[PDB]
Amino acid sequence: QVQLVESGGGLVQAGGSLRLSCAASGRLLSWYDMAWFRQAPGKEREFVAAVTSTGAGTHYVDSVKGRFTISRVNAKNTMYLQMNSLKPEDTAVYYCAAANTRLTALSLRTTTGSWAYWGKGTPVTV
Amino acid sequence: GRGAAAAILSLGNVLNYLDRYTVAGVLLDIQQHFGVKDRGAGLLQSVFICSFMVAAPIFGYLGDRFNRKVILSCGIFFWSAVTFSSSFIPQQYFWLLVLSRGLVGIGEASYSTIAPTIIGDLFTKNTRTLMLSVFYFAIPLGSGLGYITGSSVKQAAGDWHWALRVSPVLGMITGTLILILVPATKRGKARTSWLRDMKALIRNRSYVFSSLATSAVSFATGALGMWIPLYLHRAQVVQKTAEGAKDSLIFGAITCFTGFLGVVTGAGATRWCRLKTQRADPLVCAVGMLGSAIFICLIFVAAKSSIVGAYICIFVGETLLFSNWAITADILMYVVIPTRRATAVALQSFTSHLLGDAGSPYLIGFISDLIRQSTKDSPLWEFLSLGYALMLCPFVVVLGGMFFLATALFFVSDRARAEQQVNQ
């Protein structure tokens, strides 16, 4: 019974700084590993970043390292993702996803099938 | 084709836990038959548990080398035969009964460390979880049936020996089934790995406190389940009303019903408390510990008044104490990474048996003897001494509660450490 709300998405200047926020209100967020996916118009859902329950384990994509920083505040049940130096390929529809916490290698669970919870998804244009 | 095997294994586990506690329900008679002090009564259970914990890792390793069905069938027959032979020991020879209890412990350890692997191999789904729940729900039912069988057989045959005869025969009818209807499932450096796992788990904080808490729980459960029927019989003796098979019958029925109710209530409380904080699993357990303690001491103040008040306290304390069984496994699996989970489970079981159930009955008997030797000999003094000795149980319960509280304090930090190590 967890529902995710995305915010902070929209048309931005090329190479500008942006922040994306995912809010969970249905149940306590300290029990879920979260992630962000991007659906491209000409492609399918693609993995972007993921964070575990506490926030001590984060996983990215090799093409996004050093540019995006993902964090979370479990007190307010809000996950944030700061994106800087936006490349034109970053234009896509971002979906926040949550899954029940599991002690598995976060680098291994990028299959868009493990995440049983999804959000509306906001579009971002570079 | 596999459900029959699961049913037979569940019945075998029922028989296992019925035979394990059959001694307790007739323990008083044994102490009367051999004419020994309470130290020997404690020694029976202590030696049983010590042999169990010594033999458990060996059988756990051995179950991956040869045919599991063969080992299981051999162990069931071995322990059944040992129990049947012990049922004819002469009165003068007491230590032979203790040796038989040790052999029974080895045999039961084989079954307990083998059967769950077979059940896990048979099914791979939520049906596997359902089968495991059915198998592990046989523990309180088996203990209650063991108490009831011992008491009723002593009542009906007028001799305690027949109790030690009832369980093995069924095991024979069980054993053949294991060799016949149980299918053979073809499913599937160590020292250094174990040493590294132990070195890593020592540095872990919440795991150690959880192990101490479950050791305290095992201590309380073993001591109480061993000495409560004898204490109630002594109280009835000192009571003005003159009487104790019915006492053991009531205790066994309450044990089974409270085990079921407590497991269900603990699971439900964990489910309902997970929605408020992430530290729900330890804290709830801590509450249960406190919930037991305030009630356990209650019986030691209410035993001299009436039996009904004692049984009410037994019911409530059993429920609140048994509430922790389901939650302890989740507490363990939440912190330790899957690479070291098997070693963590083995070491936690070893430590819980060692620091807990291994010495609890013998320690209680030793305390009772020390208190009794310095005081006048009388049945009232026997009952009071046993009560004062069992008074050490709620103290350990409260210590375990504090350990659970510490586990709750370090829960999030250890979870973060575990996730960081997994992702590193």
The secondary structure of B313-363 as a DSSP string is HHHHHHHHHHTHHHHHHHHHHHHS-GGGHHHHHHHHHHHHIIIIITTHHHH
Q: How far is A16 from chain B (nearest CA, A)?
A: 30
Task: Name the DSSP class of A125.
Answer: B
Tell me how crowded residue B193 is: count the other CB atoms within 10 A of its CB: 12
Which residues from A are below 8 Å from B416, CB to CB? 54-56
CA distance A53 to A30: 6
d(CA B293, CA B401) in angstroms, rounded, equals 9
| Coil/strand/helix, residue B423 | helix
Residue A51, min C-alpha distance to chain B (Å): 10
Task: Please say which residue of B147, B164, B188 terminates a domain.
Answer: B188
Task: Name which of B125, B401, B177 is nearest B284 in CA terms.
Answer: B401
* CA atoms of B12 and B180, how far apart (whole Å): 14
Tell me the two tokens of residue B417. 């450490």
Same domain, B252 and B111: no
Residues B167 and B243 in one domain: no
CATH number, domain containing residue B319:
1.20.1250.20
Domains and CATH numbers, chain A: 4-124 (2.60.40.10)
Q: Do A28 and B278 touch (CB under 8 A)?
A: yes
Task: Give just the sign of the alpha carbon dihedral B69, B72, B77, B78.
Answer: positive
Q: Which amino acid is at B8?
A: I
Q: Tell me: do B134 and B202 sit in the same domain.
A: no
Phi, psi of A13 (to 5 degrees): -70, 150
Name the residue among B128, B139, B127, B119 with its Cα closest to residue B72: B119
Q: A103 near B338, Cβ under 8 Å? A: yes
Torsion, Cα of B59, B61, B67, B73 (10° steps):
10
Burial label for B91, CB within 10 Å (0-12, 13-18, 19+), is exposed
Whats the size of chain B, residue-wise?
424
Axis crossing angle, helix B360-373 with helix B392-423, rounded to the nearest 10: 150
Do the beta carbons of residue B280 and residue B168 sit within 8 Å?
no
Query: Residue B144: CB partners within 8 Å, gap ≥ 6?
Result: B252, B253, B254, B255, B256, B257, B259
Whose tokens are 């000999």? That residue is B377
Which site among A31, A102, A103 would you substitute to test the B interface, given the most B Cβ atoms closer than 10 Å to its Cβ?
A103
| Torsion angle defined by CA atoms of residues A48, A53, A58 and A60, in that order, rounded to the nearest 10 degrees | -10
Query: Which residues are within 8 A (CB) of B181 and not within 5 positions of it... i.e. 6 or more apart?
Result: B4, B5, B8
CA B414 to chain centre: 28
**Residue B420 and residue A56: Cβ atoms within 8 Å?**
yes
The pairing of beta strand A68-73 with beta strand A58-59 = unpaired
B-chain residues within 8 Å CB-CB of A28? 274-278
Pair (B346, B388) in one structural domain: yes
Q: Evaluate whether B255 touches B140 at the Cβ level (below 8 Å).
A: yes
Whether B274 sits inside 8 A of A31 (CB atoms) is yes
Residues 6+ apart with CB under 8 A from B366: B39, B42
B74 lies in the same domain as B200: no
Of B140, B171, B188, which marks where a domain is finished? Answer: B188
Domain boundary among B172, B188, B204: B188
Alpha-carbon gap, residue B305 to B313, rounded angstroms:
13
Chain B residues within 8 Å of chain A (Cβ atoms) = 274-278, 337-338, 412, 415-420, 422-424
Does residue B178 sit in the same domain as residue B287?
Answer: no
Q: Is B297 found in the same domain as B201?
A: yes
List residues of chain A with CB under 8 Å from any CB of chain B: 27-28, 30-31, 52-59, 103-107
Q: How far is B203 from chain A (nearest CA, A)?
A: 18
Dig out the tokens for B30 from the structure.
Answer: 């044994």
Look at B338 and A55 and tell me if their CB atoms are within 8 Å. no
Residue B342 main-chain phi, psi, to 5 deg = -65, -45
Gap between the Cα atoms of B334 and B236, Å rounded: 46
Domain check: are B142 and B278 in the same one?
A: no
Contact A55 B416 (CB under 8 A): yes
Contact across the interface for B419 and A107, Cβ inside 8 Å: no
Of B275, B337, B412, the CB nearest to A28: B275
- Check CB contact under 8 Å for B338 and A103: yes
Looking at CA atoms only, how far is residue A32 from chain B in angstroms? 11
Residues B292, B298, B303, B307: is their CA dihedral positive or negative?
A: negative
Same domain, B253 and B393: yes
The amino acid at residue B74 is C
Q: Taken in order B87, B92, B96, B97, is the CA torsion positive or negative?
A: positive
Q: How many CB atoms lie within 10 A of CB B159?
A: 13
Tokens representing residue B325 in the block: 């069984």
CB B299, CB B317: distance < 8 Å: yes
Start-to-end Cα distance in chain B: 44
At how many Å resolution was this determined?
3.7
- CA distance to partner chain A, nearest, from residue B417 (Å): 7
Question: Do B210 and B179 lie in a common domain?
Answer: no
Q: Does residue B101 share a domain with residue B169?
A: yes
Cβ pair B226, B361 in contact under 8 A: yes
* Residue B423 to residue A57, Cβ atoms within 8 A: yes
- Whether B233 and B382 share a structural domain: yes
| C-alpha B213 chain-centroid distance | 15
CA distance B36 to B40: 6
Total domains present in chain B: 2
B406 lies in which domain range? 189-424
Going by their DSSP bridges, the two strands A78-83 and A122-124 should be labelled as unpaired
Which structural technique was applied? Answer: cryo-EM
CB B372 within 8 A of CB B385: yes
Residue of B22, B39, B28 whose CA lies nearest to B362: B39
Per the structure block, which two tokens stand in for A111? 């299959």
Task: Read off φ and ψ for residue A99, nearest 5 degrees.
Answer: -140, 155
Angle at B308 between CA B306 and CA B311, to 5 degrees: 115
Report whether B145 contacts B248 (CB < 8 A): no
Joined tokens for residue A90? 């970053």
